[PDB]
């Protein structure tokens, strides 16, 4: 989890927030996805949130549900995801890499084995979307044992008990789904908050930083560019370039 520590200190020295794109690993294919991700980093992504294709992604809406479907139709397995992740880490030694998992994939081959494999390939953090704080202990413990940050979601309907829980057990960053809630997270020494779930234009990146968040995560908006350009890889990579550079530029203010 050191990479998040290092990233946020660097961004603080540059007086910047973090811009973090999300994509589904293997969407639309393995080689395509690897090229997408390198274009994201090249265009100025500060960290990456990477989804592992899963049969029933509950917490995910329509655009990512189709990204998940495209990676499924490409035969991308968890094992191939681990191989992709190792290569991504080997290309990009400092960028923080966070996984978006569902509980059954983490549980499937042993929880501790899963986080051990994450450690081996260079993953920095794991958010398990269908594990609440109240169920998180075995995942948290396996994560920390393998130097993985456990990411907790701080939802809109959070209350003060949850804020204290999230601040106590989370590492790396807090996944923030308003101005008062960031205040309490800071007072509670929570991991720096990244706002997600709404970030689709530069104004929203600037808004999140202005609100006191450490940055913003953009999901659907990134994946929509992939869907919109599935027939033109060159156009896809060009639009991702322009979109990410713009969103990152917005985190300076």
């Amino acid at each position: 989890m050191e990479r998040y520590e290092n990233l946020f200190a660097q961004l603080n020295d540059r007086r910047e927030g973090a811009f973090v794109p999300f994509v589904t690993l293997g969407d639309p294919g393995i080689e395509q996805s690897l090229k997408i991700i390198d274009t994201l980093i090249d265009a100025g992504a500060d960290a990456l949130e990477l989804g592992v294709p899963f049969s029933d992604p509950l917490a995910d809406g329509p655009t990512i549900q189709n990204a998940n479907l495209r990676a499924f139709a490409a035969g991308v397995t968890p094992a191939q995801c681990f191989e992709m992740l190792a290569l991504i880490r080997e290309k990009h030694p400092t960028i923080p890499i966070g996984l978006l998992m569902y509980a059954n994939l983490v549980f499937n081959n042993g929880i501790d084995a899963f986080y051990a494999r994450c450690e081996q390939v260079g993953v920095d953090s794991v958010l398990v979307a269908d594990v609440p704080v109240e169920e998180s202990a075995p995942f948290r413990q396996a994560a920390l044992r393998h130097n993985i940050a456990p990411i907790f979601i701080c939802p809109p309907n959070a209350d003060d008990d949850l804020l204290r829980q999230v601040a106590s057990y989370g590492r790396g960053y807090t996944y923030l789904l308003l101005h008062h809630l960031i205040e309490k997270l800071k007072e509670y020494h929570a991991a720096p908050a990244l706002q997600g779930f709404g970030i689709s234009s530069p104004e929203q990146v600037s808004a999140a930083v202005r609100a006191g968040a450490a940055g913003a995560i953009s999901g659907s908006a990134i994946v929509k560019i992939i869907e919109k350009n599935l027939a033109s890889p060159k156009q896809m990579l060009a639009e991702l370039r322009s979109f990410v550079s713009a969103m990152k530029a917005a985190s300076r203010a």
Binding site: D56, L69, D130, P132, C154, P155, N157, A158
Partner: protein, 395 residues
């Protein structure tokens, strides 16, 4: 933080996104309150009796056990309003919704019985009902879909994923996480996240309570076993519950064997799946070696759930209940046998349970034994399927 233990041993839990935890906590508190509230219990009993037709009969089979020392009773949930046991617990959950001030119902259904049950309960109690159903199921069960719409419910076909019960379950959860201030998610079996396995059992336990009183009245003793099919686990746990501390009474749950366990085309995760975490619970599942959820095949649509309630996995693990499987063809043979011998057309789901009682009596015909089969629904809905099968085989 919960009032009740969310686990049955190693099984169960509340594996939902954080956004849904307040909805689950609200529901648990409302249930615990309702259980201590005589006014809730009176309204529930009033509905169960005067609207749904309880108590249901306990029928002694007259012909089917001829030539054996088995006595076989059928718990007649097929006579309940709606034609299946699903009606019991939707009435209780509908009252919980009203207790919580909710005016809308969200429901999932695969075969359509729980959807129809949700819709009729919402019509009676004045709740706006929306039902999610995999589009494949919507095409396959147009009669139950029409029943739901007749009763005013909105039926929402789900095309995501496999367009079956799994994806319907997921869509209902997405909706609830946004609407739970006014809507209640009426989960239709004894599975999913806590508190649902506990609530559905408690709102089905009148099955076994009645059976116990009736069998004592009629035979002067408890059954040697009570037998029930296991799709998600609600009719079985409803029959089992009041006998769990009567350790002389066998508890036998019957999963669908489909085309045969060795074919892989079955619905028997408790005995032939692998524990996983999905649909909010830690429980045995049909899954791939890579951890993707698979489908439950059965001739009977209602046994289509790819997992099982956590209390059944727990009761199995400790040896309190035994679980077996019954194939499509055995279930069909029991269906035909009950029709001809007792004048009762059983649901193909419950025909799996009858098939296992028939195996018990035929394998050991001089064994003296007192068996109760939970007849969890009537098989009117199945006669077109049975017709097309018998015709395909030139019968």
């Amino acid at each position: 933080t919960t009032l009740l233990n969310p686990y049955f041993g190693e099984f169960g839990g509340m594996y939902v996104p954080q956004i849904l935890m307040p909805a689950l906590n609200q529901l648990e508190e409302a249930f615990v309150s309702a259980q201590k509230d005589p006014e809730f219990q009176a309204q529930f009993a009033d509905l169960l009796k005067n609207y749904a037709g309880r108590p249901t009969a306990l029928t002694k089979c007259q012909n089917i056990t001829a030539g054996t020392r088995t006595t076989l009773y059928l718990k007649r949930e097929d006579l309940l309003h709606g034609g299946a046991h699903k009606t019991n617990q939707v009435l209780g959950q509908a009252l919980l919704a009203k207790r919580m001030g909710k005016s809308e119902i969200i429901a999932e259904t695969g075969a359509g019985q729980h959807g129809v049950a949700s819709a009729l309960a919402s019509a009676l109690l004045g709740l706006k009902c929306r039902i999610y159903m995999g589009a494949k199921d919507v095409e396959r069960q147009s009669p139950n879909v029409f029943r739901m719409r007749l009763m005013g419910a909105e039926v929402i076909p789900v095309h995501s994923g496999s367009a079956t019960l799994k994806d319907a379950c997921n869509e209902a959860l997405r909706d609830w996480s946004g609407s739970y201030e006014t809507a209640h998610y009426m989960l239709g079996t004894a599975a999913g996240p806590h508190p649902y396995p506990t609530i559905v059992r408690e709102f089905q336990r009148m099955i076994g309570e009645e059976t116990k009183a009736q069998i004592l009245d009629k035979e002067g003793r408890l059954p040697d076993a009570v037998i029930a099919c296991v799709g998600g686990g609600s009719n079985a746990i409803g029959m089992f519950a009041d006998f769990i501390n009567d350790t002389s009474v066998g508890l036998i749950g019957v999963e669908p064997g489909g085309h045969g366990i060795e074919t892989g085309e079955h619905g028997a995760p408790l005995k032939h799946g692998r524990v996983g975490i999905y649909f909010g619970m830690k429980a045995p599942m049909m899954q791939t070696a890579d951890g993707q959820i698979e489908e439950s095949y059965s001739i009977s649509a209602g046994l289509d759930f790819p997992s099982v309630g956590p209390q059944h996995a727990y009761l199995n693990s400790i040896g309190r209940a035994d679980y077996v499987s019954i194939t499509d063809d055995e279930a069909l043979e029991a269906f035909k046998t009950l029709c001809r011998h007792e004048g009762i057309i059983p649901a193909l789901e419950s025909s799996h349970a009858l098939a296992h009682a028939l195996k018990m009596m035929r394998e050991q015909p001089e064994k003296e034994q007192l068996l109760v089969v939970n007849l969890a629904g009537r098989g009117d809905k199945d006669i077109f399927t049975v017709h097309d099968i018998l015709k395909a085989r030139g019968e």
